[PDB]
A paper describes a structure:
To interpret this model from a structural perspective, we attempted to determine crystal structures of the ancHMA domains in complexes with AVR-PikD. Crystallisation screens of the heterologously expressed proteins resulted in crystals of the ancHMALVKIE–AVR-PikD complex, which diffracted to 1.32 Å resolution. The structure revealed an overall architecture of the complex similar to that of previously published co-structures of Pik-HMAs and AVR-PikD. We note that the MKANK/EMVKE and IAQVV/LVKIE regions map to two of the three interaction interfaces previously described to underpin binding of AVR-PikD, and other AVR-Pik variants, to Pik-HMAs. Among tested constructs, only the Pikp-1:ancHMALVKIE chimera associated with the effector at levels similar to Pikp-1. This indicates that the polymorphic residues in the IAQVV/LVKIE region are critical for the evolution of enhanced AVR-PikD binding in Pikp-1. AncHMALVKIE formed the strongest interaction with AVR-PikD at levels similar to Pikp-HMA, followed by ancHMALAKIE, then ancHMALAQVV, ancHMALAKIV, and ancHMA, which showed weaker interactions; we did not record any significant binding for ancHMALAKVV. These results indicate that the two most recent mutations, Ala-222-Val and Val-230-Glu, collectively referred to as AV-VE, determined HMA transition towards high-affinity AVR-PikD binding. Close inspection of these structures revealed that the Val-230-Glu (V230E) substitution enhances the interaction with AVR-PikD through hydrogen bond formation with His-46. This bond is formed by Glu-230 (E-230) of ancHMALVKIE but absent in Pikm-HMA and ancHMA, which carry Val-230 (V-230) at the structurally equivalent position. We concluded that this shift is consistent with different stoichiometries of the ancHMA–AVR-PikD complexes; while ancHMALVKIE–AVR-PikD formed a two-to-one complex, the constructs with the extension interacted with the effector at a one-to-one ratio.
Numbering used by the authors:
A (entry chain A): 188 to 258
B (entry chain C): 30 to 113
C (entry chain B): 184 to 258
The structure:
């Protein structure tokens, strides 16, 4: 079980919706929280999540996702 | 089990959502003294919860004691979380 | 809950892990949602926190897109 935090630059609430849907759809997810003043940091907790693959998926779907924390 | 003992109940599944205060209580729902579900709730607060066939308004006091008009065979009980 | 955020709990279909993940994705995608978590003794419920969430509209959307859904808590 890990806590992963990813910054996803958001152009709009459509970006936030897409990013949250993608993360929450991921196998092994327990929880997802959208945090930050601009609601552009995603905290995801769960088991067997590949943080690099999740960042790559967000880069493809949304925007230049940046990995902040894996713990 | 079939005798309620909150001192021996496993902690519920929970997530302390970051956008809101951390709830102080655990609640446990029983039918015929058999655990059906559990979670977190605020002390000194109120919630509406589906308890068997009925929607029940449940109040909590400052010590995580819960009150409500539960349908026959059902009860929801509270206790303080660790560190509260 | 205390303050300006809503917390609700919706029981979601457990047809499969993928179905439960589709339900998670739909809720997480909803306007005004801040956070979602799998809760319940059987991890068959989604707890969602946010503001301006229409719990009844969300139940209807889950039933349309995913499978049966049931509101179980508002706080």
């Amino acid at each position: 079980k890990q806590k992963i935090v990813i910054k996803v630059p958001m152009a709009s609430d459509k970006c936030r919706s897409k990013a949250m849907a993608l993360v929450a759809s991921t196998g092994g997810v327990d929880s997802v929280a959208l945090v930050g003043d601009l609601r552009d940091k995603i905290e995801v907790v769960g088991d067997g999540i590949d943080s690099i693959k999740l960042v790559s998926a967000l880069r493809k779907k949304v925007g230049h996702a940046e990995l902040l924390q894996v713990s | 089990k079939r005798a309620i003992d909150l001192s021996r109940e496993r902690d519920p599944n929970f997530f302390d959502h970051p956008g809101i205060p951390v709830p102080e209580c655990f609640w446990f729902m029983f039918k015929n003294n058999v655990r059906q579900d559990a979670g977190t709730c605020y002390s000194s607060w109120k919630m509406d919860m589906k308890v068997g066939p009925n929607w029940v308004h449940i109040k909590s006091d400052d010590n995580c004691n819960l009150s409500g008009d539960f349908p026959p065979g059902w009860i929801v009980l509270g206790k303080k979380r660790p560190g509260f």
